[PDB]
Ligand binder design. Structure first.
Ligand code: UPG
Ligand code: UPG
Ligand code: CL
Ligand code: CL
Ligand code: MN
Ligand code: MN
Lengths: 280, 280
């Protein structure tokens, strides 16, 4: 009933059917992680039984952790790849976008799945639920999750999309960290910096391929790290810079300032990474 | 230390000094109210001792209440003015902006003060603190309050201003409902609809008069009705339509939709009321 292919109920497919449907295509899973020692093990454990079956590859992309993220992820059997290791010829910039962009060079799967590493008790059918529409459908090259409280999503991302790309008004969670896409699409698109990366991929995919190429899947309920409002403001600012730029609007480049009563300025970036294709 | 005149500490002035400084100028106070029976009395009580002294006029602008707002405000001694009564030649539209715009025709003070009517225990020096810089300073024609959690302010309004009008980055509470301004300025400016009205007045004042004409004052701590996120999303959407329009950006006019799992669409308006001047 939406112009967008939307699975509302627990998808039907079994692990075996999904695996059959691959037909020579490979699947990489990527867990970006910055200081997530309390949750990383459980996220890995939820996925690693799929490895050498439905999933051909799982990595943790460690984004500069100074806690025990790497040693715990290793103890869980995971290959852990630093930003450095992932693309050593290019100096490292901070932010999630960079980490995901670099993960394209550390993986070789025809389909790439992203899952956040701060999730509290993730379901082991997250990945199968997400590759469903890529594997069985035709035309689909991006799958976003939705769930059941997304303050930045509900107050910033979705109202700005109603304002400037109303066609995407039917995406329920445009900022979701859990999503899958073809390598062909991801290495052809630029990667916005920091927390701008999801909203950039969504709009560029739509602008380049239209809605027919985009699916969304219910993953149930989502629980993750709840962050203080001051941190979310910084995030929101980067979401706005990236969204305005994709819509042709000039962004000042001036970072958000907050007065807690003292003055702090958060970084914002107007620099995207290019399509990973150009690094061939 | 800011390009904006900012009173950080309890203003010095006394009620008598402020009253002397009026020099023939009159002061109207306006309380917009939609279904605020639990708080309206205390807000009125906090201000009505100023009447016939510092304040020449106090009204409640009743915005269509179906609870006991009017009868309680009356029992508190307040003149209660409906949207109808305030400007009978023009049919009533919904939203806060309309109510404030109409209040310009129901008042005659050279200075107009707005105070929200859902405030929990407001301080009786709110109004004196707000008219301070209009009464004593020179050049000032708008005074906004700030305070000490403003989710729409911190995630939408202030980051969008950093993006599109960075000069206003130093306004700490651009959406505050407690503020004062000259009649000359207010009847010269258009009034954005619904919850767009504050952000519209701020940007138009700046664009027309620059920062020198704008002051802000600490009013301490603010407590008010906490609204559900779905309601705030609608608010945020109107804040965005109004902000984009003042910045020269085309807004789709498409209202926000939410899926709670069922589909609802909230109204958004691209229609401003004209300067009240044209209704002379
Ligand atoms: O520099 C960074 C920052 C974050 N992360 C990881 O990225 C994931 C999501 O980060 P988080 O700090 O938990 O973001 P959220 O506050 O949850 O933001 C939501 O909205 C963001 C904007 O789209 C998305 O990037 C997020 O995935 C989404 O969960 C987590 O596993 C982090 O460890 C990094 O790897 N590097
Ligand atoms: O149609 C309406 C809606 C609201 N109100 C009154 O306006 C005031 C503020 O409304 P509220 O629902 O409490 O808004 P907030 O969620 O607090 O929104 C904040 O941010 C808004 C956008 O700028 C401002 O309009 C508000 O004053 C500010 O408090 C209250 O006294 C309401 O009774 C009306 O009179 N008519
Ligand atoms: Cl291409
Ligand atoms: Cl004029
Ligand atoms: Mn998170
Ligand atoms: Mn309120």
């Amino acid at each position: 009933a939406l112009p967008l292919d939307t699975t509302w109920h627990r998808p039907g497919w079994t692990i075996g059917e999904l695996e059959a449907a691959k037909a020579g295509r490979t699947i990489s899973v990527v867990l970006p992680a910055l200081n997530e020692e309390a949750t990383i093990e459980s996220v890995i454990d939820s996925i690693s039984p799929l490895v050498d079956g439905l999933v051909d590859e799982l990595i943790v992309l460690d984004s500069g952790s100074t806690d025990d993220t790497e040693i715990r992820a290793i103890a869980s059997g995971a290959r852990v790849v630093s930003r450095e290791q992932a693309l050593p010829e290019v100096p490292v910039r901070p932010g999630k976008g960079e980490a995901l962009w670099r993960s394209l060079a550390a993986t070789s799967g025809d389909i790439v799945v992203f899952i956040d590493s701060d999730l509290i008790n993730p379901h082991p059918l997250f990945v199968p639920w997400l590759v469903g529409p890529l594997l069985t459908g035709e035309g689909i090259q991006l799958v976003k999750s939705f769930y059941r409280g997304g303050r930045v999503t509900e107050l910033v991302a979705r109202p700005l999309l109603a304002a400037l790309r109303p066609e995407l008004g039917c995406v329920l969670q445009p900022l979701s960290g859990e999503y899958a896409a073809s390598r062909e699409l991801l290495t052809s698109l630029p990667f916005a910096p920091g927390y701008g990366v999801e909203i950039g991929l969504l709009i560029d995919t739509f602008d380049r391929l239209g809605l027919d190429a985009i699916a969304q899947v219910n993953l149930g309920v989502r629980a993750h790290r709840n962050r203080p409002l001051d941190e979310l403001g910084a995030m929101s600012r980067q979401v706005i810079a990236t969204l305005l730029s994709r819509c042709g609007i000039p962004d000042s480049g001036v970072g958000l300032t907050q007065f807690l009563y003292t003055r702090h300025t958060w970084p914002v970036s107007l620099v995207d990474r290019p399509p990973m294709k150009v690094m061939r």
